[PDB]
Subunit: 300 residues, 4 copies
C-alpha cells in the first residue's frame, strides 16, 4: 500500500479542507493512500487521540494539520513513536519537522500594501488566539504597523467564521469606529467584514479597504473580489507529501521549511477617500458599462 | 470502541466538509471513532478504491458521501462485503441503504418561491450532470416549472465551484440572455452568479433574483445574504451516524430515508424588475467616468 | 458480453471523434464493449476491409461512421453477412439501416438565418464532394437559397480542414468576390474562413458573416464565437448504440431515421448593413479603453 | 494478419485523435491492422479494462496512449502479460517501454522564447495535474523560469479543453491579474485563452503573448495563428508502431525513447508592450464613445 495519516482541524473551515485535498492529490500521484482523522477543537489531547487512532491504522507517517504550540507539538511528535510526523500549523521556531507559510511575509505584505496606498486608520480582525497561526498573524500585523509608525485604531477577535467577521465588524462600526482599511486573519472572516461594511452603507475598497488571508477558493468570487495573502495550499500538500516520504526513507530532511506567500491584488483595496478615483477602479466601472452597452444589441 | 469509515467527495466543496464535520460531531457524542477517506471526481472506480481503503482499516460500517448512479451504487455496496454501507448521495430509487434530502421539496420550494414573487423568466444553473444529485435537482426544477407552465429561458451547467457560477452566468448575460431570476444548484455557484450579475451592471435581488441550494455556512454572509434551500447537514450527520450503528447491529432499518428541506429567505429575491437602462443613462455614466480619467493628469 | 464494431473516418476530424466518444459512453452505460476500426480516405474498398477486420473480431453489430455513396453503402452492407449494420454517413434515401442528421433542416436553418438578417450576397464553402454528406449540404444550400430568390455568388470546395477553409476563402477574396455572408460545411473550415476574412482586414460578422456546421466542441471559443448548425453527437451516439442493439435483437426497426438539428446563434452573424457604432463595436472599444485606463496604475 | 491494439484516452481531444490517426497510417503502410479501444473514463482500472478488451482480441502488441502515473503504468504493463506493450503518456522515468516527447525541451523552448522577447510577467496555464504529462510540463516551466530568475505571476489549471482555457484565462484577467505572456499546456486551451484575452479588450500578441503546446492541426488557422511547441504526432505514430513491431519480434531495445520537439513561431508572440496612453487622450476617446452610445437612444 503505503499509507499516510492526516490529523486535521475542523474541515468546516475552507483552508484545512483545501490542504487535505492537496495532500490527497499528491498522494494519488505517487500511489500512496491517505486516511484522515478529524480533530475536535479541544486542543493537544484531542490531537493526541487522533494520532493514536492513526497509529492504530498502521500509517507509515503523519501529517499534522492542527494548531499546536511549541511544547504541544513536541508532545504530539513524541506520541508518534518511530513513525515520522510533519507539522503544518506550528511556529517555525518549534524544533520538529514542519512546513509553514511565512507569517512574517504574509503580515508584512498586507500592512505594506495598505500603508503604500495611504491608509493610516487600520482595524485588525484576528482569528482566535488559541490558534498559533492567529497569534503569529496578529503579532506580525502589530510589528509591521508599528514599524511604519501606525497603531491600529481598533482590534477584534473572530473565530475564523464569516458570521464572526460580520458580528465583530458590525459592532466596531456600531461603536462609531470607522477605519479606512482592515486586515483580516482569513478570507471567511473577510467576507463577513465586507458584508458589515456594505450593510453600513459603505463601499468595500473605496470607503473601507479589506485584505484577507489565504486565498481560499471562493475569494475571487466575493463582491468585490477579495485582495488577500495567498497561501498556496496545493504547494503545501504537494511538498508535505513529498517530504513525509523523504522522511520515511530516512532522508536527512529534518526541521522547518518555510513556504513563500504573496499578495493577490483584486478589488477590495484602494487609496483612502481622496478626490481622484483610481485607474483600476475607473477601469472596472468602464468594463461594467461596456457589458451594459453590449446588451443594447438584438438577438439573431 | 467502534470505527465508522467515511468515503467523501472532495472536502474542497463546502457541503461535504460540513457533512463530515457533523458525522464526527455525532460520533464523538456517542464514543465512536471516525476515519475518512477522500475520493477523486473519477466516479465508481475511485469510489471503490476508497471503500477498499476503509475496509482494510476494519471499520464497523461505511458512510458513502459521494455521488453514485443507480448501477454504480449497487456495485459499491457489493464491494463492502460483510460491513454495512449507508449512502448519502444517490437517488432515493436505488435499492440500497440511503439518507437523502428531498429533491422534490427543494426544487418545488425554489420554483414556487420565484413564481409567487412574479418571475416567469427563469434561468437554471445546474451542478455537473455526472452527479446524480445535480440531475435530481435539474429534473425537479423542470418538473415544477412545468407544473407552473414555464419553460426556463436558459439552462447552464457548472461544476459546483464559485468560479463556475461566475463563468456560466457571465457567459449567459453576455449572450443577452437576462433572466429576472436564477435557480442555482448550490450556494458556492450562487456566490459566483451574484458576482457576475453585479459586474454585468445589474443588481442581485432587484434586477436578477437568485436562489441557491444547501445553505452552507457562509451564505448568510454573502452580499446580499443568499436566499437558499437549507439542507441541514447537522441533521444528516447525526441521523447518518445513528443509522449506521443501527445497521451494524443488524437492526430492521434497511432502505431509504428522505430528509426535509426548507427555504431560507434572505436578501437575494424580489419581484421582477421591468425597466432596463437607456443609452443616454449609460452615456451619462461614461461621460462622468471620462471626466475622472482626464483628471489623472491635471484636475486632481 | 456484447461487442459493437465501429468503422470510422481516420482524418482526426473533430465531428467523427466526438461521435465515437459518444458511442463509447452509451455503450459503457449499457455494459457493451466497443472495438473501433479506422478507415483510410479511399472509399468502398477501405471500408469493406474495415468491416472484415471487425467481423474477424466477432462483433455482434456494426456502426459505419464513414461516408458512403449509395451503391458503395449497399456493397458495405453486403460485406456484413450475418451481422446488423447501421450507417451514419449516407443519404437518407439509401435502402439500408441508417441514422443521419437532417440535412434539409440544417441547410434551411443556415440559409433562413442569413436571409432574415438581410444577406443577399452569399458564398458557399463545401466539404469535399467525394463525401455524400458534403454533397447533401451543398445541394441543400442551393435549394433554400433558390427558394428565397438568391443565387450564391461563389461556391468553393475544401477538404474539411481548417487550412482548406483559409486557402479557399483567401482565393475567393483574391478573385475579388466579397460576399456579406458565407455558409460553411463544417466548423473547422469555418475557422479557416474566419482567419482569411480577418487577415484580409474584414470583420467576421459585420463585414462577412459566417455560419458553420456541427457545433464541434471548440466552436464556442473561436474568435468571435461561431454561429453554427448543431448536430448533437451525443444524441447520435446514444441512438445509434440503442438502435444497433435493437437490430441485433430482431426489432422491426429497419431503414432510415433522421435526427433533428438546430441553429446555435453566436457572434459571427449580423445584418450586412451594420452601422459602425453598433452596441457590440462600442462595447469592444470601451473594454479596450478600460484596459488602457487600468494600465495607469503603478507602485500603488 | 498482424494486429495492433491501441488503448487511447478520449478521441474528443485533438492530440490523442491525431496520434491514433498516425498509428493507423503507419500500420496501413506496413500491412498491419489496428483495433482501438477507447477509455472515456479516468483511472487505471478503466485503462486495464481496455487492455483486457484488446487482449481478448488477440492483438500482437499494445500501444497505450493514456496518461499513467508511474505505479499505475507498471500495473497496466503487468495486465498485458505476454504481449508487448508500449506507453505513450508516461514519465520517462518509469521502467516500462515508452516513447515520449521531450518535456524538458518543450518547456525550455516556450520559456526561452518569452524571455528572449523581454517577458518578465508570465502566467502558466497547466493541463489537469492528474495527467502526468501535464505535471511534467508544469514542472519544466518552473525549472526553466526559475533558471531565468522569473517566478510566474499566476498559475491556473484547465482540463485540456478550449472552454477551460477561456474560463481560466477570463477568471484570472477579471480577478485583476494581467500577465504580458502565457505559457499554455495545449493548443485547445490556448484557443480559449486567446478568446478571453480578446474579449477582455486586449490583443493577442501585441498585449498578451501566447505559446501553445502540440501544434495540433487547427493551430495554424487560429486568430492570430498560434505560436506553439510542435509535438510531431505523425512521427509519434510512425515510430511507436515500428517500435512495437520490433518489441514483438524481441529486437527489444527496451525502456524509454525521447522524441524531439520544436518551437513553431507564428503570430501570438511579440515583445511586451511598454506604451501607455495619456489620460487626456483616453478621456477624449471615452467622451467620443459616450456620445456614440447616447446616439443609440434610438438612432439607427
Amino acid at each position: 500500500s503505503l499509507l499516510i495519516g492526516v490529523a486535521t482541524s475542523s474541515l468546516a473551515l475552507h483552508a484545512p479542507s483545501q490542504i487535505v485535498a492537496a495532500i490527497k492529490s499528491r498522494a494519488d500521484q505517487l500511489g500512496a493512500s491517505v486516511v484522515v482523522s478529524m480533530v475536535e477543537r479541544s486542543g493537544v489531547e484531542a490531537c493526541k487521540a487522533a494520532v493514536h487512532n492513526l497509529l492504530a491504522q498502521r500509517v507509515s507517517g503523519l501529517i499534522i494539520n492542527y494548531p499546536l504550540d511549541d511544547q504541544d507539538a513536541i508532545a504530539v511528535e513524541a506520541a508518534c513513536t518511530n513513525v515520522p510526523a510533519l507539522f503544518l500549523d506550528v511556529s517555525d521556531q518549534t524544533p520538529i519537522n514542519s512546513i509553514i507559510f511565512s507569517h512574517e511575509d504574509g503580515t508584512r505584505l498586507g500592512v505594506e500594501h495598505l500603508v503604500a496606498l495611504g491608509h493610516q486608520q487600520i482595524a485588525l480582525l484576528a482569528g482566535p488566539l488559541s490558534s498559533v497561526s492567529a497569534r503569529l498573524r496578529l503579532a506580525g500585523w502589530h510589528k509591521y504597523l508599528t514599524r511604519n509608525q501606525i497603531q491600529p485604531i481598533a482590534e477584534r477577535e473572530g473565530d475564523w467564521s464569516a458570521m464572526s467577521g460580520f458580528q465583530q465588524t458590525m459592532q466596531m462600526l456600531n461603536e462609531g469606529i470607522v477605519p479606512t482599511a482592515m486586515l483580516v486573519a482569513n478570507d471567511q472572516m473577510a467576507l463577513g467584514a465586507m458584508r458589515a461594511i456594505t450593510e453600513s452603507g459603505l463601499r468595500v475598497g473605496a470607503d473601507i479597504s479589506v485584505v484577507g488571508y489565504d486565498d481560499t477558493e471562493d475569494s475571487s468570487c466575493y463582491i468585490p473580489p477579495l485582495t488577500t495573502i495567498k497561501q498556496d495550499f496545493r504547494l503545501l500538500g504537494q511538498t508535505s507529501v513529498d517530504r513525509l516520504l523523504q522522511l520515511s526513507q530516512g532522508q536527512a530532511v529534518k526541521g522547518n521549511q518555510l513556504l513563500p506567500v504573496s499578495l493577490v491584488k483584486r478589488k477590495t483595496t484602494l487609496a483612502p477617500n481622496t478626490q481622484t478615483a483610481s485607474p483600476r477602479a475607473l477601469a472596472d466601472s468602464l468594463m461594467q458599462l461596456a457589458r451594459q452597452v453590449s446588451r443594447l444589441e438584438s438577438g439573431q
